Design a protein around this ligand. Structure first.
Ligand SMILES: O=C(O)CNC(=O)C(=O)O
Ligand SMILES: [Mg+2]
Ligand code: NI
Ligand SMILES: [Zn+2]
Length: 331
């Protein structure tokens, strides 16, 4: 069995190996990468996502989200308060202000320490989930707006034709902006490219141990657990590495820098934070190996998780028994 300790693997494809996206994912899995839940892919030196970022300040963040925390430093939830629209140029200036900027620090470890110590005492503003792409249309390799669609994968594997579309999303971050513990919708893969700016630190639980994290989460968030049998789908709960280590939960951590891709694998729980002003692009995708995970994915039916149009068909075809109750949640 490859990668039996479930370590995060880092890949350095050549320009030749960067041509065929599906093939390279399957290669990484042949080496055991999926067992970690997360992999890093460093693009060949010849590749670029686009020529420059000099012209992005006019993108609109229609609904910036102020991430307000409740709880204790190592175990908290966050709620998203909607703020007035602002441009990326306005957001960048905000991120760089004295109130929101990254503090002085020695290295990534010192910054990680300061994040876990102090996150809860601040409310950083996140421009999340903005439909769009920063890949140049002429970038032919690993262009996250040109991937094969999940609908087409399901059709190729299972024969059924379904409605729905699959497009990327932009994320504009600042110091302390936080992504809560989650897996993807329908336990899909994700791919995330850090276009510019400061790093993103990731934490991940191997897929084979995801239920251990769920059981801890039910213990740590007991009212939330009573409210919903899949409350991590709400994407609000944070648990620190120190607390994970105290409770024996297997995990790994890695920091992504600008110019790097990360892939999350089906049912790989992940969480993290941004080090300063940055812009990431991410999209879900599927492979044949995902289908079985899609069939078994939990679902939020309490009504809180409220997701995309395209998830309907996935539930309807892969989980027909759950369909009815899940759609009651969405309506
Ligand atoms: O970058 C972020 O804020 C969150 N991204 C993801 O969870 C992902 O790419 O799967
Ligand atoms: Mg612009
Ligand atoms: Ni994710
Ligand atoms: Zn729910």
């Amino acid at each position: 069995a490859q990668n039996p300790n479930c370590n995060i693997m880092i890949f350095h494809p050549t320009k030749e190996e960067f041509n065929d996206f599906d093939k390279y994912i399957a290669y990484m899995e042949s080496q055991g990468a999926h067992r970690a839940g997360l992999a890093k892919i460093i693009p060949p030196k010849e590749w670029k996502a686009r020529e420059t970022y000099d012209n992005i300040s006019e993108i609109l963040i229609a609904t910036p989200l102020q991430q307000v925390a409740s709880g204790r430093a190592g175990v908290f939830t966050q709620y998203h308060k909607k703020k007035k629209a602002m441009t990326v140029g306005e957001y960048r200036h905000l991120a760089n202000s004295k109130k929101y900027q990254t503090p002085p620090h020695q290295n990534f470890e010192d910054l990680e320490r300061k994040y876990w110590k102090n996150r809860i005492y601040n409310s950083p503003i996140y421009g999340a989930d903005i439909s769009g792409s920063l890949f140049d249309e002429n970038t032919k390799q690993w262009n996250l707006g040109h991937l094969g669609t999940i609908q087409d994968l399901l059709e190729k594997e299972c024969g059924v034709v379904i409605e729905g579309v699959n497009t990327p999303y932009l994320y504009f971050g600042m110091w302390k902006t936080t992504f809560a513990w989650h897996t993807e919708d329908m336990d899909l893969y994700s791919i995330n490219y850090l276009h510019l700016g400061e790093p993103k630190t990731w934490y991940v639980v191997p897929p084979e141990h995801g239920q251990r994290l769920e059981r801890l989460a039910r213990e740590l968030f007991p009212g939330s657990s009573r409210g919903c049998g899949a409350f991590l789908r709400h994407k609000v709960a944070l648990i620190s590495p120190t607390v994970l280590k105290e409770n024996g939960i297997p995990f790994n951590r890695i920091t992504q820098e600008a110019g790097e891709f990360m892939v999350t694998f089906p049912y790989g729980y992940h969480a993290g934070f941004n080090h300063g002003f940055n812009c990431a692009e991410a999209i879900n995708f599927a492979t044949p190996r995902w289908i079985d995970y899609g069939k078994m994915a939990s679902q939020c039916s309490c009504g809180e998780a409220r997701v995309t149009f395209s998830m309907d068909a996935f539930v309807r075809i892969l989980q027909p028994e759950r369909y009815d109750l899940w759609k009651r949640g969405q309506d």
